Ligand SMILES: O=C(c1ccc(Cl)cc1)N1CCSCC1
């Protein structure tokens with residue numbers, strides 16, 4: 001009970017308009033056979049082209065929605081749509097390409113999947129709302145067999161070349177013509193009523209239906225992300241390191257300590273209200289302040305309503321207007337004016353951040369976090385937090401080659417005295433690096449309007 005048994009039943013009702021007469025009684029084994037593939041009773045790490053929900057959720061970085069529409073089955077041209085927004089027309093002889101034979105279409109499919117996936121995943125998972133033409137199209141661009149390694153590296157093979165008779169991963173596949181050992185999941189097997197559009201549109205207003213294959217491909221993946229990461233949420237599932245996950249997370253800890261430490265020193269709040277992750281620890285353990293925690297899990301669907309977070313259930317309940325509120329990746333509709341905020345910007349392009357449901361994004365860094373669409377109006381009571389580095393640490397090198405640092409934003413005794421010491425120059429440059437990492441990863445920082453770094457210079461005298 002890890003992989004999907006090929007002897008599992010497959011409901012064929014979705015198939016029966018493209019494939020009239022299809023048996024009601026159907027297994028994956030029989031379906032794979034009718035798709036023109038032979039598994040040869042093979043114990044070589046590829047037991048089934050189709051995978052479980054649980055397996056798909058572990059391989060979310062690999063999801064490519066895929067849809068095929070009859071254009072006029074051997075008779076007629078097929079429109080191939082992918083969640084990348086690409087439409088290819090294959091002839092048997094929003095990006096929309098003219099009709100070409102399979103021998104050239106399959107080359108474009110490998111190039112497209114390789115460019116999309118090489119920095120994301122070791123595989124492809126085709127996310128289907130299966131009606132028949134998508135499954136019958138696979139024999140024309142897919143080959144299967146035993147698990148293999150790349151000819152040029154140690155990564156599992158994802159592509160095959162009929163020219164060279166060799167196997168490549170996504171990194172090494174230029175000129176390859178076949179997708180090799182793809183995986184796939186039919187969303188329609190999950191038990192929905194009515195068509196794709198009617199189910200997608202319950203949850204999402206951002207993906208229209210232009211009645212083209214890529215639109216269905218996008219809607220199919222969106223619906224799948226909704227089901228697996230919005231309505232259902234599993235934070236136990238770990239995901240491999242593929243990028244700067246570790247640097248970004250370190251940077252996040254450093255910036256959070258820096259900004260909160262400086263807010264307490266500058267404005268001397270007697271109480272801090274720490275709203276969000278119930279596992280959260282004091283980010284400034286030495287600070288004078290009354291530190292009060294409020295538990296809120298990461299919201300995957302809609303931003304929290306500040307009315308419901310701060311709702312008073314009895315008298316003598318905490319005054320959130322006293323001191324300052326820390327919302328560190330706690331996404332709310334509208335922050336109060338007395339807030340310090342870190343808010344993930346869902347629009348950011350990275351390998352960590354996958355497109356999500358209804359303008360949200362699926363941010364995958366150790367764990368998967370569906371994040372509600374970034375909204376600028378949430379920040380109306382605040383301003384953007386400007387970059388600064390602050391330290392009360394002694395000017396003292398210890399233990400890196402130097403250009404003397406000149407910066408208005410290096411808030412240290414040494415800079416107060418007109419000359420930045422080597423230690424604080426090294427720390428400044430490391431912190432500016434951490435800060436830039438975190439920003440470019442898509443985090444945005446917001447602060448109460450009265451916040452002024454000028455107030456920090458008098459914390460040394
Ligand atoms: O792969 C095919 C297929 C095979 C041969 C021919 Cl001539 C047409 C279609 N499918 C999808 C699986 S169910 C039966 C149709």
Ligand SMILES: [Zn+2]
Pocket residue numbers: 150151152153154155168169170171172
């Ligand atoms: Zn390789």
Ligand SMILES: [Zn+2]
Pocket residue numbers: 200204205206207218219222223356357358
């Ligand atoms: Zn959608």
Ligand SMILES: [Zn+2]
Pocket residue numbers: 394395396412413414415420421422423424
């Ligand atoms: Zn110094």
